[PDB]
């Protein structure tokens, strides 16, 4: 199955990207495997008129399906080559592009925000094509950045859809890559407070949050857009990959391109808060490197912690969750021999 992933459409035509164009996915069916990797594409999001207008001027393709090619190649965990994907090269592979600008949480029908609806529809569409058709199947829902949040917000819903409504005999797991953000004091004041944007997003998107998390923040459910608040109520196994000096957290923290020691020291502390915010997490791989995203990259085999590579840690976690904390032990940017480029 070395061939590319192939575009497919959704039956329910009322499920749409931001601009009204139809959504869908890419598929590479494997002739015999019962394992599925479903990868949610990432980006950022837009939460009001100005930001959405601007995203439509600066990033049209993430709000519409018109520019989409008929096929996609994706490396890392959706690669069909064993050198690049030593444990999942022979599974069924699905890519869901991100055209809803809502961290895969929207249910609203100048724009539409159907993220959570898109995801539930794609999963519905995979059943007739073999997903959990045979007992002993497995679904790994994985995503990067906003895709990471997409996974955490829907993972419990999807397991409960498939194991309970649909009564399939399937093990369901999630992986969030680089989607674990913090609400903290920025380096310099920015136009809007982190928490106010999340609140507007929730309302604009009509965001569908998980109930067990919503119960623990009943005054303000939008808190569940943060990894570290979502996680303690999450029941389905979730593997968290996080660059301890993540670039997207730096943009959020409004640090600018670091050329001063005050900026670099703010970054050093930003890694320490990230690290601590992962205190609770049972399965985690967090190297002290500058970066954003990893699961889709050919380099994903190369990053190690204590000589344990990411695919190898992920494989071990799969083994032991058929029914694992690796944080870098030095604390400064680029102290890992194997940091990328």
Swiss-Prot record:
Function: Carboxylesterase that acts as a key negative regulator of the Wnt signaling pathway by specifically mediating depalmitoleoylation of WNT proteins. Serine palmitoleoylation of WNT proteins is required for efficient binding to frizzled receptors. Also acts as a regulator of long-range activity of Hedgehog (hh), possibly by regulating the switch between low and high level hh pathway signaling.
Major enzyme class: hydrolase
Glycosylation, residue list: 12, 280, 336
Predominant location: secreted
GO biological process: digestive tract morphogenesis; negative regulation of canonical Wnt signaling pathway; positive regulation of smoothened signaling pathway; protein depalmitoleylation; regulation of compound eye pigmentation; ventral cord development; wing disc development; wing disc dorsal/ventral pattern formation
Induction: Expression is induced by Wnt.
A GO cellular component entry from the record: cell surface
GO MF annotation terms: palmitoleyl hydrolase activity
Keyword DNA repair: no
Cysteine disulfide links: none
Family the entry assigns: Belongs to the pectinacetylesterase family. Notum subfamily.
Gene name in the database record: Notum
Protein name: Palmitoleoyl-protein carboxylesterase NOTUM
Keyword GTP-binding: no
Organism: Drosophila melanogaster
Active site, UniProt feature: 145, 246, 292
TM annotation in the entry: none
Enzymatic reactions: [Wnt protein]-O-(9Z)-hexadecenoyl-L-serine + H2O = [Wnt protein]-L-serine + (9Z)-hexadecenoate + H(+)
Subcellular localization, as worded in the UniProt entry: Secreted; Cell surface
Keywords, ordered alphabetically: Glycoprotein, Hydrolase, Secreted, Serine esterase, Signal, Wnt signaling pathway
Entry superkingdom: Eukaryota
E.C. number(s) listed in UniProt: 3.1.1.98
